[PDB]
């Protein structure tokens, strides 16, 4: 009956971005190291503690490269193409942009470059949860909307402490609930980071309110 097809949507686009985790992690794993010569270059040529441009244009010329990141971005993006936000969108085109405009020792639109690659990388994990908004929004189900609204806050609440860590932790979580399989309220981080209980008790409310739902479709 009423929220099988709502079900069937969540599963397809669960499933579809399985890997949305893991391939941010990639970008990350990459470029890190480009992202912190700059970072340490500006740092230490801000205090006169001499230039060595080279590292800054090395670490531009890396991001520039084949448009690899550009188009591992853009990858991120088509993962969620029905769901994307256009938060997404300008962002990709704009750092695509400031990357074709960097020009060698020129050092501020490094910061510039390097202060949009962080934001990107956030924006992605927070389009994944906008797509899980957009979603679960659709159901005809009062706890399972409000709990969803509760999981999509806490989420974004997670991802300002650390995209990456979680964006990881959204993606399993959400991936258990839609496979049927107990969702973990253990900090997987031993609460080193410390927004991660408020959103797995967010995701119990979820998981609740999922359960109740499958019963109705049995």
Do not use: W
């Not at 006169?48 to 991001?63: E, F, R």
């Amino acid at each position: 009956r009423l929220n099988q097809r709502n079900i069937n949507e969540l599963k397809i686009f669960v499933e579809k971005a399985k890997y949305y985790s893991i391939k941010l992690d990639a970008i990350y794993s990459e470029y890190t190291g480009a992202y912190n010569d700059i970072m340490t270059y500006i740092m230490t040529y801000s205090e006169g503690t001499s230039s060595d441009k080279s590292k800054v244009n090395q670490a531009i010329s890396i991001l520039k490269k084949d448009n690899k990141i550009v188009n591992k971005f853009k990858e991120l993006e088509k993962i969620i193409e029905e769901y994307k936000p256009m938060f997404l969108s300008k962002l990709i085109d704009d750092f695509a942009i400031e990357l074709d405009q960097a020009v060698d020792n020129d050092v501020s639109n490094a910061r510039h470059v390097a202060d949009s690659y962080e934001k990107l990388r956030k924006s992605v994990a927070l389009a994944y949860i906008e797509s899980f908004d957009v979603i679960s929004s659709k159901f005809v189900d009062s706890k399972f909307v409000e709990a969803s609204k509760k999981f999509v806050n806490k989420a974004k609440e997670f991802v300002e402490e650390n995209d990456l860590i979680a964006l990881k932790c959204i993606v399993k979580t959400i991936g258990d609930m839609v496979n049927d399989r107990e969702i973990n309220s253990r900090s997987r981080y031993n609460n080193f980071y410390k927004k991660e209980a408020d959103f797995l008790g967010a995701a119990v409310e979820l998981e609740g309110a999922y359960k109740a739902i499958k019963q109705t479709l049995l």
